[PDB]
């Protein structure tokens, strides 16, 4: 929960700390994440791209963030074979669902 | 005036300067002929302050040298292949190994810890024989810093160590952390006759150590097994 | 004492080339040396959400909200031209032989025991059965994977090129030969004799395989499908990409190789499903299941260990399976 | 009394370039100057699970679930154009000479002692035997490692280029000469004479080696393989990289140099296993074994020390081995591992 809150706070601080949204040259997957996790469509961004980002909230960005978090946490078959690792996976899924809900409520 | 911490030396730089209005001096930390760090320290510093200015670099060098020259590990596995039952840190390889994968033909196998494993099947009595023969002392990593020709068992190629090599193991700054008095009592000598060994140059009243005393001292300190 | 080696790798035999694709009209197939090549092109597609979405969603407002999304993508596609009814593919393959020896090993005694084991297998019976299976799989056009269904008449031409010019020739019909069983025929026996001579190392073999398939005019052909990087947007072939040698659609060589070794009939669980491609834990990714399940003592590894170490040589069909797996090649280490 | 030096180093002789590849059709072999290069491409690969498994695995549900999620790789590959059947390989070679002199030393007495040792060797035997074995390894196309196997016919031309033009020429059939033995032949003897002249410091030699190998149409070739480094990858990256100079597939120069010095037939293990490359503790990596183990008295260091310090000259083939190891160059002394 502290990691999820720190990630949400760092995303909010990076968003509000950003003065303007610039078209990143070669930001590989950074535009796909920053359609929602980036700032509003300013004059540097296209209005049609801003309307498309308002059309679809970044659920796939939340999936990629959950994948990066699950890759950051070292897992093994002892958690898959044990029930405690299944409970930890269920708790991580509940935290990822809460983070995706908080992202989708502000998104769009 | 230099300061000596085991095989390390800390010297000042013979003409100071004024930094921020206060007089200072440059200091250098050596490891034999190799210079490692340089700091600029003010005066009105006791030698303990100059010691723990560099203590952290000394400790980091010790950590890296301990990890690099660590001995090899063998392990005992049952017939499946996983679930290691016991481990041992050897100083040599048992000379009969050749790359193996354990099967159900035998209930005990003795594999290496490196990844393309070599292995051998054993029967828990020869395993104890190999553990008695090939084990390693607790401070075997100090042998990685020694020239080898002062470590051989053959008397024809051996040469006595110098004082700088001898400060690796004896003295309060050494890696074993044993005194000269305790090492003299370990050999059944006086403190003065042992201090005769560590003078610095044989012209200035200094004698070489014997073959037998050197190997027995390495045995008693837990550095080389010396069977 | 003797134990199995820890690193062990075998270089493959039966290397195919890549399968280039050309097109033309039927009964010009005695002059198919200047036929033009098929070209991959671009296409746009705007479809609907046809997937099984998450049920117990009693909200059709989000449903017809999602209906108004055209979700346009851009699709690579390659088709036959308007004036051609016949598709022509072409590749070469060589047979190497010396299929006993590994390419890397740790132990020497294990390697010598393995060498004398395959020597006993060869002196018992040569490569005649396996080359019969391989020539049979070569005769029917199995390597055309999805370009074989819905075909009128498929004819393959085989050339054994000893010098720069052709030495011998075959000419088969595909659909007479089944994709199910292994029969006998004198031309097939001559081809299997040549392949078994190549696998024994008695002489080198270079083959050239050309096929013709009368699909019709303007239909769609299927080359191999590439990998799409998700770092881009919804444009730039965001759907699929087709494999191509320079300005020509083509098929990957491992597709040809997987089609050629589809000879495993001795898998125990059934027999009415036809032959399988040979590999340890004999499995197919289309069915998503694994025959030769290793808790049954019929995988490649346990059979090989019981053969080489304890000298419990299995039944002759399982020995065929093991030697075919060694002809496939791979990495057999821990 | 005379001990060994603490620092010793020898630069190498027999310096090759790195060879690059090209393609064409046979019987255009005498016009092969505009034959285009062989480039590298990429392709996708989906693989199965085909390796051994641990015992906590092989519960069949876990195995099937492993088969469910596949792995997708990208791979560099290189192969012939679809209308050619001959591969062309080209590189140059310098024989330097002066093999006795070290590049760094401490004892002068050790230096001139081994200098007079190699002078006595070069007075007794010439460089004829080693140059014969070297010209043998140049004759057969051993430097084609995997491109040689399964080939139909292979022909190699050498040009001795002295000024800006050719001086002498050689032609061979590489599969006539075996990879198993060392015969005699007049043209090969002239080539070995030229090489032994270059090794002895007599003249200045520079060769150009061209090889033609008949493979087939569209078939795969094998360049050297690079090393990829990635720190916690995302399982969609490449898994194979090939060496290329200026967009043309190529072989590393040390691969050629390792193939050239495959002349050790004198190792005490056996004789039906073929010659290996000259090494201290002479070891091949495919077998994972070390011939000339130092517990036998047949490694490079003990032979050298018995020859130099205590004058036990070994057998003449061991002297050939030691001189070959000195021609190879390396680092000896108290930089020990």
The SS3 assignment for D84 reads coil
CA nearest to C214, candidates C31, C90, C88, C82 = C88
CA dist list (Å): D46 to C225, C255, C285: 11, 10, 11
| Packing angle, helices C186-199 and C128-139, rounded to 10 | 120
Nearest residue of B to residue D337, measured between CA atoms:
B144
For residues B166 and B197, the answer to whether their CB atoms sit within 8 Å is yes
CA dist list (Å): B203 to B165, B180, B190, B200, B206: 18, 21, 21, 9, 7
The SS3 assignment for D76 reads strand
DSSP A37: S
> Rounded to whole angstroms, how far apart are CA atoms D4 and C224?
65
CA nearest to D38, candidates D5, D68, D82, D73 = D82
> Rounded to whole angstroms, how far apart are CA atoms B198 and B164?
9
Do the Cβ atoms of D152 and C229 come within 8 Å? no
CA atoms within 13 A of residue A94's CA, in its CB half-sphere: 7
D43 vs C20, C105, C243: nearest CB: C243
Helix (H) or strand (E) holding D318: helix D316-328
Question: Token pair for residue B185?
Answer: 């009592």
> Rounded to whole angstroms, how far apart are CA atoms D280 and D300?
5
For residues D144 and D175, the answer to whether their CB atoms sit within 8 Å is no
Taking the Cβ of residue B154 and every Cβ of chain D, the question of whether any pair is shorter than 8 Å is answered with no
DSSP D198: H
Judging contact as 3 or more Cβ pairs under 8 Å, the answer for B and A is no
Do the Cβ atoms of D63 and C290 come within 8 Å? yes
CA dist list (Å): B170 to B62, B176, B184, C93, C207: 16, 7, 10, 72, 76
Do the Cβ atoms of C204 and D43 come within 8 Å? no
Please report residues of C whose CB lies closer than 8 A to that of A29. 230-231
DSSP C113: H
Q: Which residues contact B162 (CB under 8 A, 6 or more apart)?
A: none
Cross-strand partners of D37: D22
Do the Cβ atoms of D54 and B99 come within 8 Å? no
> Rounded to whole angstroms, how far apart are CA atoms C196 and D112?
63
Please report residues of D whose CB lies closer than 8 A to that of B148. 336
CA nearest to D157, candidates D205, D90, D211 = D211
For residues D103 and D268, the answer to whether their CB atoms sit within 8 Å is no
Question: Token pair for residue D140?
Answer: 């057969």
> Rounded to whole angstroms, how far apart are CA atoms B149 and C225?
64
> Rounded to whole angstroms, how far apart are CA atoms B151 and B154?
9
Do the Cβ atoms of D56 and B99 come within 8 Å? no
Q: Which residues contact D297 (CB under 8 A, 6 or more apart)?
A: D303, D306
Helix (H) or strand (E) holding D91: strand D86-95
> Rounded to whole angstroms, how far apart are CA atoms B106 and B120?
10
Do the Cβ atoms of D334 and B99 come within 8 Å? no
CA nearest to C2, candidates D290, D78, B99, B37 = B99
In 10 A of CB C309, how many CB atoms? Answer: 15
> Rounded to whole angstroms, how far apart are CA atoms C266 and D16?
53
Please report residues of C whose CB lies closer than 8 A to that of A49. none
Do the Cβ atoms of D49 and C18 come within 8 Å? no
DSSP secondary structure, C136-158, as one string: HHHHTTTTSSSSSTT-S-EEEEE
Q: Which of C54, C71, C231, C235 is the mutation pick for testing A, counting most A CBs within 10 A? A: C231
Calculate how close chain B gets to C333, using CA atoms only, in Å: 9
**Residue with tokens 């000394």, as numbered in its chain:** B58
CA nearest to C11, candidates C138, C117, C135, C96 = C96
Q: Is B114 left (phi over 0), alpha (psi -120 to 50) or beta?
A: beta
CA nearest to B135, candidates B177, B100, B94, B77 = B94
Calculate how close chain C gets to D44, using CA atoms only, in Å: 6
Q: How far does chain B reach from its first CA to its final CA, in angstroms?
A: 43
Resolution (A): 3.2
Cross-strand partners of C37: C22
CA nearest to C87, candidates C97, C78, C95, C96 = C78
Boundaries of every domain in chain D: 1-11+99-126+263-337, 12-98+127-262
CA nearest to B27, candidates B48, B7, B1, B6 = B1
Question: Token pair for residue D258?
Answer: 């390792």
CA nearest to D16, candidates D202, D188, D261 = D261
Nearest residue of C to residue D152, measured between CA atoms:
C204
Angle (nearest 5°) at CA D166 between D161 and D167 = 85
The SS3 assignment for A4 reads helix
The distance between the two most distant Cα atoms of chain D, rounded to a whole number of Å, is 75
Question: Token pair for residue C156?
Answer: 């393959």
> Rounded to whole angstroms, how far apart are CA atoms D181 and B34?
52
Helix (H) or strand (E) holding D155: strand D154-161
Please report residues of D whose CB lies closer than 8 A to that of C96. 149-150
Question: Token pair for residue A72?
Answer: 């950051």
Question: Token pair for residue D328?
Answer: 């190879």
For residues D46 and D72, the answer to whether their CB atoms sit within 8 Å is yes
Cross-strand partners of C207: C93, C160
Taking the Cβ of residue A25 and every Cβ of chain C, the question of whether any pair is shorter than 8 Å is answered with no
Calculate how close chain D gets to B154, using CA atoms only, in Å: 15
B148 vs D56, D288, D336: nearest CB: D336
D82 vs C106, C245, C285: nearest CB: C245
Please report residues of C whose CB lies closer than 8 A to that of A28. 231
Question: Token pair for residue D240?
Answer: 């194979």
Question: Which chains lie within 8 Å of chain C at 3 or more CB pairs, if any?
Answer: A, B, D
Cα dihedral across residues D306, D310, D316, D319: positive or negative: positive
Question: Token pair for residue B144?
Answer: 């990685």
In 10 A of CB C15, how many CB atoms? Answer: 19
For residues C212 and C86, the answer to whether their CB atoms sit within 8 Å is yes
For residues D247 and D39, the answer to whether their CB atoms sit within 8 Å is yes
- Residues C96-101: contacts with CB within 8 Å, 24+ apart? C96/C13, C96/C14, C96/C15, C96/C198, C96/C204, C96/D149, C96/D150, C97/C13, C97/C198, C97/C199, C97/C200, C97/C201, C97/C202, C98/C201, C99/C10, C99/C13, C99/C199, C99/C323, C99/C326, C99/C327, C100/C326
Q: How far does chain C reach from its first CA to its final CA, in angstroms?
A: 20
Taking the Cβ of residue C54 and every Cβ of chain A, the question of whether any pair is shorter than 8 Å is answered with no
Question: Token pair for residue B213?
Answer: 């005393």
Please report residues of C whose CB lies closer than 8 A to that of D288. 7, 104-106
Question: Token pair for residue C192?
Answer: 């299997």
> Rounded to whole angstroms, how far apart are CA atoms B116 and D101?
40
Q: Which residues contact C190 (CB under 8 A, 6 or more apart)?
A: C168, C170
- Residues D234-239: contacts with CB within 8 Å, 24+ apart? D235/D71, D235/D72, D236/C227, D236/C229, D236/D72, D236/D74, D237/D74, D238/D42, D238/D73, D238/D74, D238/D75, D238/D76, D239/D73, D239/D74, D239/D75
DSSP A86: H
> Rounded to whole angstroms, how far apart are CA atoms B110 and B87?
10
For residues D104 and D7, the answer to whether their CB atoms sit within 8 Å is yes
The SS3 assignment for D85 reads coil
Helix (H) or strand (E) holding C23: strand C19-24
Question: Token pair for residue C310?
Answer: 């304890």
The values of phi and psi at residue D200, to 5°, are: -85, 5
CA nearest to C227, candidates D43, D69, D78 = D43
Cα dihedral across residues D81, D83, D87, D89: positive or negative: negative
Taking the Cβ of residue B196 and every Cβ of chain C, the question of whether any pair is shorter than 8 Å is answered with no
- Residues C308-312: contacts with CB within 8 Å, 24+ apart? C308/C4, C308/C110, C308/C113, C308/C114, C308/C117, C309/B103, C309/B105, C309/C2, C309/C3, C309/C4, C310/B105
Q: Which residues contact C99 (CB under 8 A, 6 or more apart)?
A: C10, C13, C118, C199, C323, C326, C327
Nearest residue of C to residue A29, measured between CA atoms:
C231
Do the Cβ atoms of B147 and D54 come within 8 Å? no
DSSP secondary structure, C275-332, as one string: -EE--SS-EETTTTEESS-TTSTTSHHHHHHHHHTS-----HHHHHHHHHHHHH-EE-
> Rounded to whole angstroms, how far apart are CA atoms D277 and D291?
11
Do the Cβ atoms of D43 and C164 come within 8 Å? no
For residues C191 and C184, the answer to whether their CB atoms sit within 8 Å is no
Question: Token pair for residue D302?
Answer: 């003990």
In b/e form, how buried is each residue of B172-211, taking b as 16+ CB within 10 angstroms? ebbbbebebeebbeeeeeeeeebeebeeeeeeeeeeebee
Cross-strand partners of C103: none
C-alpha A15 chain-centroid distance: 12
C-alpha D332 chain-centroid distance: 21
CA atoms within 13 A of residue B111's CA, in its CB half-sphere: 23
Please classify residue D157 by burial: count the beta carbons closer than 10 Å to its beta carbon, then call 0-12 exposed, 13-18 middle and 19+ buried: middle
Question: Which chains lie within 8 Å of chain D at 3 or more CB pairs, if any?
Answer: B, C
CA dist list (Å): C210 to A99, C141, C194, C285: 58, 10, 18, 28
Nearest residue of C to residue D148, measured between CA atoms:
C96
> Rounded to whole angstroms, how far apart are CA atoms B63 and B147?
20
DSSP secondary structure, chain B, as one string: --EEETTEEEEE-SS-EEETTEEEEEEEEEETTEEEEEEEEESS--HHHHHHHHHHHHHHHHHHHHHHTPPEEEEEE-SSS-S--EEEEESS--S-----B--TT-S-EEEESSSS----B--SSHHHHHHHHHB--TTGGGGGGS-STTT-S-TTT-----HHHHTTTBBTTSSS-B-HHHHHHHHT--HHHHHTTTSS-GGGT--PPPHHHHHHHHHHTTS----
Pairing of the two strands C15-16 and C86-95:
antiparallel
Please report residues of C whose CB lies closer than 8 A to that of B102. 3
Judging contact as 3 or more Cβ pairs under 8 Å, the answer for C and D is yes
Question: Which chains lie within 8 Å of chain B at 3 or more CB pairs, if any?
Answer: C, D
Calculate how close chain C gets to A27, using CA atoms only, in Å: 9
The values of phi and psi at residue C182, to 5°, are: -120, 105
The SS3 assignment for D332 reads strand
For residues B175 and B223, the answer to whether their CB atoms sit within 8 Å is no
> Rounded to whole angstroms, how far apart are CA atoms D328 and D15?
10
Calculate how close chain C gets to D78, using CA atoms only, in Å: 11
CA atoms within 13 A of residue A68's CA, in its CB half-sphere: 10
> Rounded to whole angstroms, how far apart are CA atoms A43 and A23?
10
Q: Is D288 left (phi over 0), alpha (psi -120 to 50) or beta?
A: left
Do the Cβ atoms of C289 and D149 come within 8 Å? no
Cross-strand partners of B40: B26
Question: Token pair for residue B59?
Answer: 């400790």
For residues C243 and C228, the answer to whether their CB atoms sit within 8 Å is no
B–D: how many Cβ contacts below 8 A? 10
**Residue with tokens 């590849």, as numbered in its chain:** D21
CA dist list (Å): C198 to A28, C65, C203, C324, D84: 51, 64, 6, 15, 23
Q: Which residues contact B107 (CB under 8 A, 6 or more apart)?
A: B78, B79
> Rounded to whole angstroms, how far apart are CA atoms B211 and B76?
37
The SS3 assignment for C248 reads strand
Pairing of the two strands C41-46 and C205-214:
unpaired
Do the Cβ atoms of B101 and C3 come within 8 Å? yes
CA atoms within 13 A of residue D337's CA, in its CB half-sphere: 2
Do the Cβ atoms of B118 and C4 come within 8 Å? no
């Amino acid at each position: 929960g502290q990691i999820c809150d720190e990630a949400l706070q760092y995303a909010a601080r990076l968003r509000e700390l950003e003065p303007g949204w610039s078209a990143t040259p070669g930001c590989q997957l950074h535009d796909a994440e920053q359609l929602w996790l980036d700032p509003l469509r300013a004059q540097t961004d296209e209005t049609f791209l801003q309307r498309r980002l308002r059309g679809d909230w970044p659920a796939e960005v939340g999936n990629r963030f959950a994948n990066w978090l699950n890759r950051a946490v070292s897992s093994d078959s002892q958690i898959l074979g044990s029930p405690e690792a299944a409970q930890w996976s269920q708790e991580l899924s509940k935290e990822l669902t809460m983070f995706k809900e908080i992202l989708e409520d502000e998104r769009d | 005036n230099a300061i000596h911490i085991g095989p390390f030396s800390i010297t000042p730089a013979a003409r100071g300067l004024h930094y921020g209005g206060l007089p200072h001096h440059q200091w250098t930390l050596y490891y034999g002929p190799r210079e490692m760090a340089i700091k600029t320290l003010p005066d009105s510093y006791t030698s303990s302050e100059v010691r723990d200015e560099f203590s952290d670099i000394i400790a980091e060098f010790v950590i890296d040298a301990r990890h690099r020259y660590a001995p090899d590990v063998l392990e005992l596995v049952n017939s499946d292949g996983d679930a290691v039952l016991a481990r041992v840190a050897v100083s040599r390889l048992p000379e009969a190994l050749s790359g193996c994968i354990p099967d159900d033909r035998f209930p005990y196998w003795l594999l290496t810890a490196s990844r393309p494993r070599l292995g051998l099947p054993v029967t828990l009595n020869e395993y104890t024989a190999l553990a008695v023969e090939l084990s390693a002392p607790p401070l075997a990593w100090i042998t990685g810093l020694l020239p080898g020709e002062v470590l051989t068992h053959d008397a024809e190629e051996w040469r006595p160590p110098t004082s700088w090599e001898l400060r690796h193991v004896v003295g309060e700054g050494s890696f074993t952390g044993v005194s000269g008095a305790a090492a003299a009592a370990l050999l059944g000598m006086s403190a003065t006759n042992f201090r005769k060994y560590t003078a610095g140059d044989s012209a200035a009243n200094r004698q070489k150590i014997s073959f037998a005393a050197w190997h027995y001292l390495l045995d008693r300190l837990g550095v080389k097994r010396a069977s | 004492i003797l134990s199995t080696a820890s690193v062990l790798a075998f270089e493959r035999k039966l290397d195919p080339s890549d399968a280039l694709m050309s097109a033309g009209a039927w009964a010009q197939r005695d002059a198919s040396q200047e036929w033009p090549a098929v070209t991959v092109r671009e296409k746009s597609v705007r479809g609907t959400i046809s997937n099984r979405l998450k049920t117990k969603d009693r909200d059709p407002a989000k449903l017809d909200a999602s209906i108004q999304s055209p979700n346009l993508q851009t699709v690579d596609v390659a088709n036959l031209p308007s004036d051609a009814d016949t598709l022509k593919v072409r590749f070469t393959l060589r047979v190497l032989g010396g299929a006993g020896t590994p390419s890397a090993c740790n132990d020497a005694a294990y390697r010598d025991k393995l060498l004398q084991t395959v020597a006993t297998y060869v002196n018992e019976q040569g490569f005649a059965e396996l080359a019969r299976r391989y020539a049979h799989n070569l005769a029917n056009a199995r390597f055309l994977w999805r370009n074989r269904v819905g075909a009128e008449a498929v004819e393959v031409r085989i050339n054994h090129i000893r010098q720069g010019e052709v030495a011998r020739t075959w000419r088969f019909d595909a659909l007479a030969i089944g994709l199910r069983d292994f029969k006998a025929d004198a031309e097939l026996d001559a081809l299997a004799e040549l392949i078994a001579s190549g696998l024994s190392g008695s002489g080198h073999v270079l083959l050239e395989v050309v096929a013709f398939a009368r699909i019709g005019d303007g239909q769609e052909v299927f080359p191999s499908q590439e990998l799409i990087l998700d770092k881009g947007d919804k444009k730039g072939q965001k759907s699929k990409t087709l494999y191509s040698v320079r300005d020509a659609a083509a098929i990957h060589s491992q597709k040809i190789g997987n089609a050629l070794r589809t000879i495993d009939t001795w898998y125990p669980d059934e027999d009415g499903l036809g032959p399988i491609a040979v590999e340890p834990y004999g499995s197919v990714t289309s069915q998503g299941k694994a025959y030769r399940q290793p808790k049954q003592k019929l995988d490649f590894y346990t059979l090989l260990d019981n053969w080489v170490l304890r000298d419990e040589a299995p039944a002759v069909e399982q020995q065929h399976y093991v030697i075919a797996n060694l002809i496939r090649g791979g990495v057999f280490g821990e």
